[model samples]
Target: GYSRAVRCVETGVEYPSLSAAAKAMDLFGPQNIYKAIRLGKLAGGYHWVYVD
Candidate 1:
C-alpha cells in the first residue's frame, strides 16, 4: 500500500503524493520533499491513496 498524499502548507495546493508534488514544484525528488518537511517548508500524509 502507498502512503497518504501531502499538501503544500505555504501554497495551499493539494498533491497526489509527495514525489509527484515535488516534480510538479520543480523539486529533485522525495528526498527534497523530506527535507522540505523537516525544514518546515512542506507537509505530508494528509490524504492517503493507493498507487501502483
Candidate 2:
C-alpha cells in the first residue's frame, strides 16, 4: 500500500499518472474501504484500464 502523496494542480491525481493514483486508491480502498481486500475477496494486480 502506498502512502497518500500531496495533491496539486500541476499533478492531477487522476490525469498525469493514473496507475499511481489507482494504486493509491486500491490501497486506500482496503484500510479505508471496509477491509474488503484484506478480507480476501478482491484481487490486486497490475492493470492498464485507462486510454487517453
Best candidate (score: lDDT): 1
Tens-digit per-residue lDDT, 15-52, candidate 1: 77768877876767867776766565443432222222
Off by over 4 Å in 1: 42-52
Assess each prediction's global lDDT (C-alpha) against the native. 0.60, 0.34
Model 2 residue 51 lDDT score:
23
* Candidate 1 lDDT trough over 10 residues, lowest sum: 43-52
Alpha-carbon shift of residue 29 in model 2 (angstroms): 13
Best by TM-score: 1
15: Cα error in model 1, Å? 0.7
Segments in model 2 whose C-alpha atoms lie over 4 Å from true places: 1-16, 27-52
Global lDDT for candidate 1? Answer: 0.60
- lDDT accuracy of residue 34 in candidate 2: 28
